[PDB]
Scaffold this motif. Structure first.
Motif, PDB file in Angstrom:
ATOM      1  N   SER A 113     -17.811  15.894 -29.503  1.00  0.00           N
ATOM      2  CA  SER A 113     -17.799  16.609 -28.062  1.00  0.00           C
ATOM      3  C   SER A 113     -18.086  15.862 -27.129  1.00  0.00           C
ATOM      4  O   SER A 113     -19.051  14.750 -27.007  1.00  0.00           O
ATOM      5  N   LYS A 114     -17.958  16.122 -25.691  1.00  0.00           N
ATOM      6  CA  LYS A 114     -18.409  15.476 -24.400  1.00  0.00           C
ATOM      7  C   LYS A 114     -20.100  15.327 -24.506  1.00  0.00           C
ATOM      8  O   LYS A 114     -20.349  14.507 -24.021  1.00  0.00           O
ATOM      9  N   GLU A 115     -20.499  16.630 -24.953  1.00  0.00           N
ATOM     10  CA  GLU A 115     -22.000  16.704 -24.973  1.00  0.00           C
ATOM     11  C   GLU A 115     -22.521  15.704 -25.906  1.00  0.00           C
ATOM     12  O   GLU A 115     -23.526  14.983 -25.665  1.00  0.00           O
ATOM     13  N   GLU A 116     -21.774  15.709 -27.200  1.00  0.00           N
ATOM     14  CA  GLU A 116     -22.468  14.953 -28.308  1.00  0.00           C
ATOM     15  C   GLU A 116     -22.040  13.278 -27.836  1.00  0.00           C
ATOM     16  O   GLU A 116     -23.076  12.504 -28.318  1.00  0.00           O
ATOM     17  N   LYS A 117     -21.233  12.871 -27.211  1.00  0.00           N
ATOM     18  CA  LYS A 117     -21.211  11.708 -26.839  1.00  0.00           C
ATOM     19  C   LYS A 117     -22.172  11.264 -25.825  1.00  0.00           C
ATOM     20  O   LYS A 117     -23.110  10.184 -26.292  1.00  0.00           O
ATOM     21  N   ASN A 118     -22.388  11.908 -24.865  1.00  0.00           N
ATOM     22  CA  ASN A 118     -23.586  11.512 -23.931  1.00  0.00           C
ATOM     23  C   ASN A 118     -24.860  11.853 -24.381  1.00  0.00           C
ATOM     24  O   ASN A 118     -25.893  10.887 -24.267  1.00  0.00           O
ATOM     25  N   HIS A 119     -25.110  12.739 -25.453  1.00  0.00           N
ATOM     26  CA  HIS A 119     -26.326  12.599 -26.148  1.00  0.00           C
ATOM     27  C   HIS A 119     -26.471  11.412 -27.008  1.00  0.00           C
ATOM     28  O   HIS A 119     -27.731  10.806 -27.123  1.00  0.00           O
ATOM     29  N   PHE A 120     -25.485  10.937 -27.722  1.00  0.00           N
ATOM     30  CA  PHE A 120     -25.460   9.726 -28.226  1.00  0.00           C
ATOM     31  C   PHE A 120     -25.986   8.381 -27.500  1.00  0.00           C
ATOM     32  O   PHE A 120     -26.578   7.501 -28.000  1.00  0.00           O
ATOM     33  N   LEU A 207     -32.446   2.355 -38.608  1.00  0.00           N
ATOM     34  CA  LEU A 207     -32.239   2.826 -37.159  1.00  0.00           C
ATOM     35  C   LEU A 207     -32.059   4.279 -37.147  1.00  0.00           C
ATOM     36  O   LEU A 207     -32.726   4.914 -36.173  1.00  0.00           O
ATOM     37  N   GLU A 208     -31.282   4.815 -37.982  1.00  0.00           N
ATOM     38  CA  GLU A 208     -31.239   6.157 -37.962  1.00  0.00           C
ATOM     39  C   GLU A 208     -32.216   7.122 -38.086  1.00  0.00           C
ATOM     40  O   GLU A 208     -32.506   7.918 -37.323  1.00  0.00           O
ATOM     41  N   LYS A 209     -33.174   6.735 -39.177  1.00  0.00           N
ATOM     42  CA  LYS A 209     -34.483   7.117 -39.228  1.00  0.00           C
ATOM     43  C   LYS A 209     -35.163   7.223 -37.865  1.00  0.00           C
ATOM     44  O   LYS A 209     -36.010   8.109 -37.603  1.00  0.00           O
ATOM     45  N   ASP A 210     -35.539   5.783 -37.473  1.00  0.00           N
ATOM     46  CA  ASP A 210     -36.404   5.641 -36.135  1.00  0.00           C
ATOM     47  C   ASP A 210     -35.868   6.649 -35.136  1.00  0.00           C
ATOM     48  O   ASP A 210     -36.577   7.095 -34.329  1.00  0.00           O
ATOM     49  N   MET A 211     -34.410   6.699 -34.908  1.00  0.00           N
ATOM     50  CA  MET A 211     -34.079   7.530 -34.083  1.00  0.00           C
ATOM     51  C   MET A 211     -34.269   8.891 -34.069  1.00  0.00           C
ATOM     52  O   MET A 211     -34.291   9.688 -33.224  1.00  0.00           O
ATOM     53  N   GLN A 212     -34.160   9.441 -35.329  1.00  0.00           N
ATOM     54  CA  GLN A 212     -34.338  10.785 -35.582  1.00  0.00           C
ATOM     55  C   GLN A 212     -35.665  11.089 -35.339  1.00  0.00           C
ATOM     56  O   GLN A 212     -35.981  12.240 -34.686  1.00  0.00           O
ATOM     57  N   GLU A 213     -36.832  10.460 -35.610  1.00  0.00           N
ATOM     58  CA  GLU A 213     -38.296  10.584 -35.059  1.00  0.00           C
ATOM     59  C   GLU A 213     -38.308  10.284 -33.719  1.00  0.00           C
ATOM     60  O   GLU A 213     -39.170  11.239 -32.770  1.00  0.00           O
ATOM     61  N   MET A 214     -37.810   9.356 -33.075  1.00  0.00           N
ATOM     62  CA  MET A 214     -38.040   9.280 -31.568  1.00  0.00           C
ATOM     63  C   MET A 214     -37.424  10.620 -30.771  1.00  0.00           C
ATOM     64  O   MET A 214     -37.978  10.973 -29.849  1.00  0.00           O
ATOM     65  N   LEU A 215     -36.344  11.098 -31.293  1.00  0.00           N
ATOM     66  CA  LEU A 215     -35.851  12.073 -30.490  1.00  0.00           C
ATOM     67  C   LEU A 215     -36.485  13.561 -31.261  1.00  0.00           C
ATOM     68  O   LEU A 215     -36.027  14.481 -30.887  1.00  0.00           O
ATOM     69  N   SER A 219     -31.546  15.954 -37.852  1.00  0.00           N
ATOM     70  CA  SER A 219     -30.177  16.006 -38.146  1.00  0.00           C
ATOM     71  C   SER A 219     -29.418  14.828 -37.380  1.00  0.00           C
ATOM     72  O   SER A 219     -28.367  14.626 -37.548  1.00  0.00           O
ATOM     73  N   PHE A 220     -30.038  14.036 -36.489  1.00  0.00           N
ATOM     74  CA  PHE A 220     -29.292  13.080 -35.516  1.00  0.00           C
ATOM     75  C   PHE A 220     -28.835  12.187 -36.563  1.00  0.00           C
ATOM     76  O   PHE A 220     -29.329  11.662 -37.494  1.00  0.00           O
ATOM     77  N   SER A 221     -27.502  11.759 -36.174  1.00  0.00           N
ATOM     78  CA  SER A 221     -26.748  10.812 -37.069  1.00  0.00           C
ATOM     79  C   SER A 221     -26.237   9.894 -36.476  1.00  0.00           C
ATOM     80  O   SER A 221     -25.651  10.117 -35.253  1.00  0.00           O
ATOM     81  N   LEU A 222     -25.745   8.586 -36.827  1.00  0.00           N
ATOM     82  CA  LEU A 222     -25.057   7.551 -36.275  1.00  0.00           C
ATOM     83  C   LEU A 222     -23.559   7.768 -36.402  1.00  0.00           C
ATOM     84  O   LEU A 222     -23.440   7.874 -37.493  1.00  0.00           O
ATOM     85  N   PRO A 223     -22.858   7.758 -35.269  1.00  0.00           N
ATOM     86  CA  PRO A 223     -21.396   7.893 -35.443  1.00  0.00           C
ATOM     87  C   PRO A 223     -20.557   6.608 -35.967  1.00  0.00           C
ATOM     88  O   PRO A 223     -21.588   5.646 -36.217  1.00  0.00           O
ATOM     89  N   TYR A 224     -19.309   6.550 -36.369  1.00  0.00           N
ATOM     90  CA  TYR A 224     -18.781   5.252 -36.458  1.00  0.00           C
ATOM     91  C   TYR A 224     -17.583   4.920 -35.605  1.00  0.00           C
ATOM     92  O   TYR A 224     -17.130   5.876 -34.927  1.00  0.00           O
ATOM     93  N   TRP A 225     -17.171   3.570 -35.703  1.00  0.00           N
ATOM     94  CA  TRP A 225     -15.871   3.120 -34.847  1.00  0.00           C
ATOM     95  C   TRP A 225     -14.966   2.733 -35.760  1.00  0.00           C
ATOM     96  O   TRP A 225     -15.068   1.840 -36.622  1.00  0.00           O
ATOM     97  N   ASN A 226     -13.612   3.502 -35.859  1.00  0.00           N
ATOM     98  CA  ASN A 226     -12.618   3.176 -36.789  1.00  0.00           C
ATOM     99  C   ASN A 226     -12.138   1.816 -35.813  1.00  0.00           C
ATOM    100  O   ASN A 226     -11.188   2.119 -35.104  1.00  0.00           O
ATOM    101  N   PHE A 227     -12.451   0.719 -36.529  1.00  0.00           N
ATOM    102  CA  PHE A 227     -11.809  -0.523 -35.828  1.00  0.00           C
ATOM    103  C   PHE A 227     -10.418  -0.961 -36.389  1.00  0.00           C
ATOM    104  O   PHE A 227      -9.885  -1.846 -35.884  1.00  0.00           O
ATOM    105  N   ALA A 228      -9.956  -0.037 -37.573  1.00  0.00           N
ATOM    106  CA  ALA A 228      -8.800  -0.677 -38.240  1.00  0.00           C
ATOM    107  C   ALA A 228      -7.679   0.034 -37.805  1.00  0.00           C
ATOM    108  O   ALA A 228      -6.887   0.908 -38.520  1.00  0.00           O
ATOM    109  N   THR A 229      -7.386  -0.032 -36.392  1.00  0.00           N
ATOM    110  CA  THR A 229      -6.347   0.551 -35.870  1.00  0.00           C
ATOM    111  C   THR A 229      -5.209  -0.273 -35.631  1.00  0.00           C
ATOM    112  O   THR A 229      -4.020   0.081 -34.811  1.00  0.00           O
TER     113      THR A 229
END
Ligand SMILES: *[C@@H]1O[C@H](CO[C@@H]2O[C@@H](C)[C@@H](O)[C@@H](O)[C@@H]2O)[C@@H](O[C@@H]2O[C@H](CO)[C@@H](O)[C@H](O)[C@H]2NC(C)=O)[C@H](O)[C@H]1NC(C)=O
Ligand SMILES: *[C@@H]1O[C@H](CO)[C@@H](O[C@@H]2O[C@H](CO)[C@@H](O)[C@H](O)[C@H]2NC(C)=O)[C@H](O)[C@H]1NC(C)=O
Ligand SMILES: *[C@@H]1O[C@H](CO)[C@@H](O[C@@H]2O[C@H](CO)[C@@H](O)[C@H](O)[C@H]2NC(C)=O)[C@H](O)[C@H]1NC(C)=O
Ligand SMILES: *[C@@H]1O[C@H](CO)[C@@H](O)[C@H](O)[C@H]1NC(C)=O
Ligand SMILES: NC(=S)Nc1ccccc1
Ligand SMILES: [Zn+2]
Ligand SMILES: [Zn+2]
Ligand SMILES: [Zn+2]
Length: 446
Positions: A113-120, A207-215, A219-229
């Motif tokens: 979502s627009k909020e989830e993108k901004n939060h990441f 990194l995901e773990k460090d960011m979970q505790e920083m925040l 449940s914070f998770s790292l998204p992915y980029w489908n670069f195979a387009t």
């Protein structure tokens, strides 16, 4: 690379990194949480099997037989406890008793979502600025680790995201042979070998773990980029995500993105490889990025095609001799990108992961700097998604992952360099949803 309580004169002289959890009879009384049932201090298990003859400098580099050149004692945590002092839980578990299961979902960045993108984007920017509460990084090799007077440990604080950049740099840096001598460069503890996928898997997990505790967001998770387009452009290079191209310098990031404010670490190879120092926490220039801009090299001006991903998932053996960037029919070498998506090696080929890196034609496509561009994060969660689908498809068959004669750093039981506490490739060679507490929301072409 080490807990700040082990980056002391006393701990380095003792060879012991077994810090207290909560001692209530004085120092050293709760090492590794031993007063609860959480863990104990014990001898380090490190790999002693032989490596390939490509590395001729045994005895010269602190990364050999990791981590024995700094510590020979570590915490081993009981059950599903984990962490440098056994005060936290193994991936996929939470609670004071580490008995409440968690499962986070890594999603396509464009589907948020627009909020989830901004939060990441602001979480990343927060991690770039926030000091790592646990780890400090060495600025000198071991013989100079205690400083000029022998009583000043040469460690610096570093932000959560720069520590992510630094461990990658340290795994690829050249072996320093001495002032006046040429550094040895045919060594790589995280690429061009079987450990490429497991190394980057742990890299993301840390990194995901460090960011979970920083925040303080479990449940914070790292998204992915489908670069195979097969695209001509970077579809995540927009100012609500990762930043578009600057209209004032086509190799810089748009000033309407916070990532244009980032300054990179580890960009002084001239200094490191001639004076024998290490990358420190002082930042330098900006991120350079120019998607599809490598005009001198037309093959790296377009991203992988969707069918490239489908074809590499048909490669059934994880790796093949000689377990290097010239292996044929190796899933690891195919998805890394040194062979074409069918497994055919060709020294002129750049595919998948390697091609996505080179497509950026900038900081994210330079071997000593690439994590400085936060696209690295999304590029490697996707690479990890392909690995996880391979693990599901071929029943996590680790049999072709060599126990010996791999490039140095890549034997199956090598402790992945420089991660702490010691963690082997084997521990990451597991299907993520049942063993590491995360899964990918993704579907595969066919
Ligand atoms: C376990 O480690 C101790 C501490 O030695 C340090 O360990 C490494 C970081 C390495 O870089 C050494 O140079 C460090 O000194 C070992 O004990 C010392 O061993 C050295 C020679 O090996 C000796 O000169 C010192 O007197 C020893 N000091 C103490 C306090 O023991 C110990 O031998 C190691 N045990 C092993 C490897 O089984
Ligand atoms: C951190 O690393 C930087 C980069 O290597 C060091 O700065 C360089 O130091 C050398 C030698 O002292 C100089 O010749 C360069 O001109 C410096 N470059 C820059 C960009 O400043 C810096 O000294 C290191 N810091 C510590 C504490 O070691
Ligand atoms: C980004 O791509 C450009 C090419 O568009 C690279 O610049 C070329 O580099 C080669 C090899 O050093 C030179 O022979 C050419 O003369 C360069 N051309 C131009 C126009 O500069 C550049 O090296 C790439 N940078 C990164 C970080 O990938
Ligand atoms: C790191 O920062 C701490 C504060 O958390 C501070 O006391 C000190 O300057 C730094 N420590 C080291 C070992 O550099
Ligand atoms: N340039 C980067 S970041 N990775 C890489 C390494 C070897 C070959 C092609 C790409
Ligand atoms: Zn044990
Ligand atoms: Zn890498
Ligand atoms: Zn990479």
């Amino acid at each position: 690379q080490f807990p700040r309580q082990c980056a002391t004169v006393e701990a380095l002289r003792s060879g012991m990194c077994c810090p207290d959890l909560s001692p209530v009879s004085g120092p050293g009384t709760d090492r590794c949480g031993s007063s609860s049932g959480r863990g104990r201090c014990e001898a380090v298990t490190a790999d002693s099997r032989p490596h390939s003859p490509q590395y001729p400098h045994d005895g010269r580099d602190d990364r050999e037989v990791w981590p024995l050149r700094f510590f020979n004692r570590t915490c081993h945590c009981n059950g599903n406890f984990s962490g440098h002092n056994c005060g936290t839980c193994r991936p996929g578990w939470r609670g004071a008793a580490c008995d409440q299961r968690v499962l986070i979902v890594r999603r396509n960045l464009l589907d948020l979502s627009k909020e989830e993108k901004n939060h990441f984007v602001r979480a990343l920017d927060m991690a770039k600025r926030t000091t790592h509460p646990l780890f400090v990084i060495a600025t000198r090799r071991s013989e100079e680790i205690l400083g000029p007077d022998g009583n000043t440990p040469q460690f610096e604080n570093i932000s959560i995201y720069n520590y992510f950049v630094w461990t990658h740099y340290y795994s690829v840096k050249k072996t320093f042979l001495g002032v006046g001598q040429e550094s040895f460069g045919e060594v790589d503890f995280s690429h061009e070998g079987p450990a490429f996928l497991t190394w980057h898997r742990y890299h993301l997990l840390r990194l995901e773990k460090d960011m979970q505790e920083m925040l303080q967001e479990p449940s914070f998770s790292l998204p992915y980029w489908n670069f195979a387009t097969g695209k001509n452009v970077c579809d995540i290079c927009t100012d609500d995500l990762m930043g578009s191209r600057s209209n004032f310098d086509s190799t810089l990031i748009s000033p309407n993105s916070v990532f244009s404010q980032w300054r990179v670490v580890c960009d002084s190879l001239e200094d490191y490889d001639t004076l024998g120092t290490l990358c420190n926490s002082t930042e330098d220039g900006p991120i350079r990025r120019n998607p599809a801009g490598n005009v001198a090299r037309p093959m790296v001006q377009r991203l992988p095609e969707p069918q490239d991903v489908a074809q590499c998932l048909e490669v059934g053996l994880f790796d093949t001799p000689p377990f290097y960037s010239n292996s044929t029919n190796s899933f690891r070498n195919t998805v890394e990108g040194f062979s074409d998506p069918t497994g055919k090696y060709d020294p002129a080929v750049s595919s998948l992961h390697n091609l996505a890196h080179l497509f950026l034609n900038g900081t994210g496509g330079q071997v000593h700097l690439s994590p400085n561009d936060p696209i690295f994060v999304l590029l490697h969660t996707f690479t990890d998604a392909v690995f996880d689908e391979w693990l599901r498809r071929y029943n996590a068959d680790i049999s072709t992952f060599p126990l010996e004669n791999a490039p140095i750093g890549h034997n199956r039981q090598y402790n992945m360099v420089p991660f702490w506490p010691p963690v082997t490739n084997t521990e990451m060679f597991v299907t993520a949803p049942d063993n590491l507490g995360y899964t990918y929301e993704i579907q595969w072409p066919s």
